[PDB]
Design a protein around this ligand. Structure first.
Ligand SMILES: O=C(O)COc1c(C(=O)O)sc(-c2cccc(N(C(=O)c3ccccc3)C3CCCCC3)c2)c1Br
Length: 297
């Protein structure tokens, strides 16, 4: 049971060991396509690749490769696409993927510049009047509006397939204060953001999988997805005790390597799930408490 386990790990100060055990047991599958010479410039990090078996394929004859994985959580009945921060040459691919996969939401957990380096290309328009066209994939992207809070911003985007003139609304959820290799300020501020994404309808099975990324698409992204899936599993069963967090993380790691980068991110995942469980089990008041504690305004 998660809460008892949490206290036992804390008391014995063994988060590092628990986390390393997960690294040790984690799945290992080939990433041969990602490692092809022709794809070298499509990868942000040499050592972070999608497994072949779960990679997202772009629907183009030329090169179907993008550094992105479909995390398909069978029991939870929710899917996520985890991906790296797009590069200057893969922003067209990124939006092609969003289009083809019918995603309604994009969750961004990093800033474009972190610790002096460019962790992500500027892949969305920052001004209404300066829309972006991706010539390679024939897509147009327009900023429609944005709602800026103290630590996150929600943007409304219009994605147009120039080939069909079909348009879709994409919601962009941008968490701006989550440190690389770090954790959110609090469970409250994390859960407040997660519930914004949930309340948008972006996670509905009627849409394609939400796209989740940070810089490498594994650390912060893995933390976000683990917490969401655990809360969803608990919700479907109305039984917080039935959820084995480490087992869920290991399942997710079948679909993308390295999910959750540090022991404290793992510890933080417990914190968020334990706190979120309050809402799941019928304490609706905690949601406004998180909002307040998060200092949105
Ligand atoms: O989102 C976060 O919290 C941190 O995200 C990340 C980065 C960033 O935002 O700059 S860079 C990054 C990354 C890139 C390449 C390799 C690795 N991996 C490491 O063990 C590692 C960790 C720190 C420094 C160098 C390597 C291994 C290599 C084997 C596969 C798993 C990761 C990690 C991650 Br992850």
């Amino acid at each position: 049971e998660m809460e008892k386990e949490f206290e036992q790990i804390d008391k014995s100060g063994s988060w590092a060991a628990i986390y390393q055990d997960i690294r040790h047991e984690a799945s290992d599958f080939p990433c041969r396509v990602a490692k092809l010479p022709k794809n070298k410039n499509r990868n942000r990090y040499r050592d972070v690749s999608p497994f072949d078996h779960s990679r997202i394929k772009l629907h183009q004859e030329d090169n179907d490769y993008i550094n992105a994985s479909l995390i398909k959580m069978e029991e939870a009945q929710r899917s996520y696409i985890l991906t790296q921060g797009p590069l200057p040459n893969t922003c067209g691919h990124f939006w092609e993927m969003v289009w083809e996969q019918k995603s309604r939401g994009v969750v961004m957990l990093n800033r474009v510049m972190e610790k002096g380096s460019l962790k992500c290309a500027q892949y969305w328009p920052q001004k209404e009047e300066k829309e972006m066209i991706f010539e390679d994939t024939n897509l147009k992207l327009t900023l429609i509006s944005e709602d800026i809070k103290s630590y996150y911003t929600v943007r409304q985007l219009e994605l147009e397939n120039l080939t069909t003139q079909e348009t879709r609304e994409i919601l962009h959820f941008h968490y701006t204060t989550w440190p690389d290799f770090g954790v959110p300020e609090s469970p409250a501020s994390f859960l407040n953001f997660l519930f914004k994404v949930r309340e948008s309808g972006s996670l509905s099975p009627e849409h394609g999988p939400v796209v989740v990324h940070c810089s490498a698409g594994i650390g912060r992204s893995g933390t976000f997805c683990l917490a969401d899936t655990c809360l969803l599993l608990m919700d479907k069963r109305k039984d917080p005790s039935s959820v084995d967090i480490k087992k869920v993380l290991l399942e997710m790691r079948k679909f993308r390597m390295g999910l959750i980068q540090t022991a404290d991110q793992l510890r933080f995942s417990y914190l968020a799930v334990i706190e979120g469980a309050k809402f799941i089990m019928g304490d609706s008041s905690v949601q406004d408490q998180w909002k307040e504690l998060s200092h949105e305004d």
